[PDB]
Amino acid sequence: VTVTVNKNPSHTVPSTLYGLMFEDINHSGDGGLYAELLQNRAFQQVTPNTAAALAAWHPISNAKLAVIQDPSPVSNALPNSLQFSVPSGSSGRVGFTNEGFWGIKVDSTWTYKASLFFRFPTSSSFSGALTVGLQTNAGRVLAQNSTQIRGTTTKWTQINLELHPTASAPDVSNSFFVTIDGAAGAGQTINFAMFSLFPPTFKNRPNGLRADIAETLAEMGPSFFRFPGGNNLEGQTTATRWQWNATVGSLLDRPGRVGDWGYVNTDGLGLLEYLQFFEDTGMEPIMAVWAGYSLGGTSLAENQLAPYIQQAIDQINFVIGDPAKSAPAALRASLGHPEPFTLRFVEVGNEDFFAAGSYPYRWHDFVTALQAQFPQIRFIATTNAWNPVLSPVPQSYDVHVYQTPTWFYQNAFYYDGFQRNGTTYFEGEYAAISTNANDLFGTVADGRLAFPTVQSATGEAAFMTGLERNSDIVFAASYAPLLQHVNSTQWTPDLVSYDAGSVIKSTSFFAQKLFALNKGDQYLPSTLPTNGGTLHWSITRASSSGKTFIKIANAGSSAQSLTFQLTQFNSVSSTGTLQVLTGPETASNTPEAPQAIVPKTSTIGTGKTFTYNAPAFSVSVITVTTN
Numbered sequence: 001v002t003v004t005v006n007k008n009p010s011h012t013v014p015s016t017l018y019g020l021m022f023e024d025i026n027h028s029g030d031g032g033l034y035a036e037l038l039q040n041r042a043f044q045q046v047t048p049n050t051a052a053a054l055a056a057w058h059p060i061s062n063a064k065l066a067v068i069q070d071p072s073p074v075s076n077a078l079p080n081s082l083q084f085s086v087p088s089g090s091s092g093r094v095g096f097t098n099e100g101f102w103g104i105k106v107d108s109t110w111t112y113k114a115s116l117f118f119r120f121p122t123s124s125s126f127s128g129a130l131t132v133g134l135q136t137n138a139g140r141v142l143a144q145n146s147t148q149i150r151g152t153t154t155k156w157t158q159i160n161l162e163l164h165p166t167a168s169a170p171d172v173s174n175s176f177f178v179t180i181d182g183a184a185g186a187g188q189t190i191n192f193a194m195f196s197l198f199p200p201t202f203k204n205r206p207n208g209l210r211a212d213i214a215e216t217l218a219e220m221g222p223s224f225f226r227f228p229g230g231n232n233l234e235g236q237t238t239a240t241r242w243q244w245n246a247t248v249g250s251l252l253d254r255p256g257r258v259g260d261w262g263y264v265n266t267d268g269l270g271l272l273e274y275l276q277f278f279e280d281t282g283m284e285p286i287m288a289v290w291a292g293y294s295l296g297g298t299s300l301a302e303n304q305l306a307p308y309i310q311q312a313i314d315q316i317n318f319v320i321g322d323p324a325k326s327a328p329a330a331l332r333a334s335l336g337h338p339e340p341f342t343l344r345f346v347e348v349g350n351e352d353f354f355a356a357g358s359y360p361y362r363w364h365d366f367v368t369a370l371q372a373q374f375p376q377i378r379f380i381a382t383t384n385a386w387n388p389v390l391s392p393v394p395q396s397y398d399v400h401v402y403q404t405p406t407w408f409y410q411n412a413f414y415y416d417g418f419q420r421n422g423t424t425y426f427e428g429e430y431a432a433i434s435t436n437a438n439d440l441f442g443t444v445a446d447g448r449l450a451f452p453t454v455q456s457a458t459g460e461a462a463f464m465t466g467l468e469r470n471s472d473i474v475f476a477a478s479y480a481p482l483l484q485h486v487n488s489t490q491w492t493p494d495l496v497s498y499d500a501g502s503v504i505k506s507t508s509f510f511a512q513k514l515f516a517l518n519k520g521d522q523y524l525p526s527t528l529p530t531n532g533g534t535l536h537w538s539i540t541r542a543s544s545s546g547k548t549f550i551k552i553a554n555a556g557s558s559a560q561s562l563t564f565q566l567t568q569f570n571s572v573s574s575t576g577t578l579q580v581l582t583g584p585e586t587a588s589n590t591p592e593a594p595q596a597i598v599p600k601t602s603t604i605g606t607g608k609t610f611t612y613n614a615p616a617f618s619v620s621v622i623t624v625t626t627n
């Protein structure tokens with residue numbers, strides 16, 4: 001096909017076009033992006049004296065363990081303690097382990113920070129060393145450090161010790177341990193609370209993020225981060241919804257909550273750690289507020305909304321508020337960031353098409369109150385576009401789609417027929433998730449993708465050429481879900497996978513990266529792709545440099561020739577760079593083959609005419625300079 005490129009731009013490409021969607025799903029927060037290595041570190045939101053309260057904790061030798069409702073808890077937010085008892089006539093090594101999130105990476109090039117709170121609930125004459133460390137799950141000690149404690153310490157006391165492994169472990173089957181001498185400790189009871197083990201973090205942030213994962217997210221060159229959900233915003237009930245103020249301050253004062261994907265969230269990954277990450281990576285937030293629906297199906301009545309609307313104002317004030325004019329903004333200042341963060345976009349709930357009967361009044365009351373307080377923010381509606389009819393008229397809608405790779409290339413013209421009437425569109429969640437049009441959300445056996453494929457990434461890429469062409473009205477777009485702990489998965493496929501040890505960059509991650517890193521501020525119209533066809537392209541240009549990005553998706557099984565005509569330009573560089581992602585249709589990056597499919601960069605001959613054969617199932621970027 002001959003593709004003529006217009007030199008005259010039709011519109012400016014929004015700076016927000018490509019970004020990330022985040023919620024704590026598949027342990028993407030606790031156990032993923034958040035660097036904490038201990039699972040169930042503070043016994044949050046568990047029933048005392050049950051097996052489930054001890055999840056991830058194990059005795060060493062004849063140790064007796066119980067999670068108790070502590071008569072004198074470490075904090076109001078953390079009512080549960082680990083009661084550790086050493087029986088009469090004990091000897092040798094007695095204590096307990098934490099198995100982490102299906103392992104702990106033990107690396108001799110890393111210094112770890114271990115902490116805990118302890119008290120003797122009954123004063124005793126005990127005198128001896130408390131030892132913390134890392135061991136293989138055979139009990140081989142790889143790191144250890146200790147400090148002296150006394151049974152006379154009846155008040156909550158923090159221990160902080162660094163750990164230096166003597167050797168890197170050969171795998172991630174390692175645990176954190178706490179031990180005392182069984183003979184010196186015989187007959188003693190110690191209460192523990194608020195455990196923590198950190199590796200070195202992204203940008204050495206206290207309470208920060210896991211380095212390989214954070215770096216991988218930054219590598220994609222995202223412009224925005226949508227958070228904190230997604231379903232993990234909503235809760236199962238009003239009482240279990242995400243609440244911003246429970247996520248800020250000292251870890252002692254964060255009660256945690258039952259999230260929406262089968263596990264407790266520590267809320268260690270809280271609003272300030274989100275905002276610090278955005279500052280660290282140059283992303284801006286698309287921040288959701290809870291809007292009076294929870295996933296159990298309960299809507300708040302119209303006459304119940306006032307306190308929840310005020311809590312949303314509180315959340316936004318923590319982010320952007322003048323510290324002299326509200327308590328939430330003064331709190332941001334007191335936690336060491338008096339300067340306001342950037343916030344230009346707020347989403348009102350998540351997927352309120354599940355509650356379209358109540359959203360009209362929830363949308364009306366939330367947006368009228370929030371737009372009056374924050375006249376510069378653009379509010380995003382989460383119902384299906386224009387059904388139901390909302391008041392005020394939404395400036396923006398969040399559109400979600402999960403479909404076959406084939407659907408994505410067949411629907412690259414999704415936005416072309418939309419009216420241009422001041423509404424902008426956020427493609428807040430999309431992914432090609434299955435090859436079975438009849439059972440999109442079913443099993444892998446029935447066509448669900450365990451990981452993104454070349455087929456799924458190339459379908460997506462064809463759909464994304466539509467998003468770029470239509471970026472006069474499409475302002476933002478994110479794949480979902482972003483992150484997957486392969487040892488605790490609730491949803492596939494995911495953009496980036498990992499275990500305790502290493503990261504897997506999917507085919508879809510490379511499509512996202514190639515689209516986001518190779519994007520100009522000008523959209524250059526070109527010959528339109530066939531609507532319904534497998535072959536799609538989108539061209540942008542950097543006004544300041546003339547760098548010109550030709551993005552080509554071949555989402556079909558046939559190679560296709562493109563002849564580009566740039567005759568309207570004064571000059572075209574005599575060479576260009578080619579970046580191509582291609583492979584077999586069903587090929588995936590997996591834990592067993594994490595580099596099976598990766599992009600290849602080369603130099604090609606260019607000018608006012610050149611020909612490129614786009615292989616079957618390929619994403620290609622050709623960069624030339626034009627003036």
Ligand SMILES: *[C@@H]1O[C@H](CO)[C@@H](O[C@@H]2O[C@H](CO)[C@@H](O[C@@H]3O[C@H](CO)[C@@H](O)[C@H](O)[C@@H]3O)[C@H](O)[C@H]2NC(C)=O)[C@H](O)[C@H]1NC(C)=O
Pocket residue numbers: 243245246255307308310311314
């Ligand atoms: C984070 O902030 C929210 C408010 O934005 C806090 O929720 C509020 O907590 C108070 C005190 O528990 C609630 O008032 C109580 O309501 C019950 C039921 O009618 C009543 O029995 C009590 O006497 C008291 O009035 C208030 O309703 C609630 N508001 C909302 C909007 O949920 C929340 O506690 C804070 N979280 C943490 C960990 O501090």
Ligand SMILES: *[C@@H]1O[C@H](CO)[C@@H](O[C@@H]2O[C@H](CO)[C@@H](O)[C@H](O)[C@H]2NC(C)=O)[C@H](O)[C@H]1NC(C)=O
Pocket residue numbers: 144145146160161162163164
């Ligand atoms: C045991 O942990 C303590 C406390 O973390 C370590 O001592 C610290 O070492 C760091 C790094 O040199 C210093 O910045 C701190 O000032 C030290 N603190 C204290 C209280 O001494 C100690 O190095 C660790 N020992 C082992 C063997 O790992």
Ligand SMILES: *[C@@H]1O[C@H](CO)[C@@H](O[C@@H]2O[C@H](CO)[C@@H](O)[C@H](O)[C@H]2NC(C)=O)[C@H](O)[C@H]1NC(C)=O
Pocket residue numbers: 385386389393418419420421422423
């Ligand atoms: C922007 O254009 C869209 C597309 O015509 C308009 O959407 C219609 O809105 C009415 C209610 O306001 C619905 O009952 C129609 O079904 C919608 N049309 C479609 C095809 O979905 C929208 O109202 C326009 N918005 C503005 C701000 O003018």
Ligand SMILES: *[C@@H]1O[C@H](CO)[C@@H](O[C@@H]2O[C@H](CO)[C@@H](O)[C@H](O)[C@H]2NC(C)=O)[C@H](O)[C@H]1NC(C)=O
Pocket residue numbers: 102103486487499591592
């Ligand atoms: C976490 O998931 C990884 C990846 O699936 C597991 O390691 C794999 O285990 C399978 C089958 O059980 C082996 O055939 C693979 O060779 C392993 N792959 C790799 C890359 O190691 C691991 O066992 C899981 N960990 C836990 C604790 O369940």
Ligand SMILES: OC[C@@H]1NC[C@H](O)[C@H]1O
Pocket residue numbers: 023025229230231232350351429480481491
């Ligand atoms: O991305 C996974 C889920 N898809 C719908 C919901 O908004 C998300 O939690």
Ligand SMILES: [Cl-]
Pocket residue numbers: 404405406407434435436
């Ligand atoms: Cl398909």
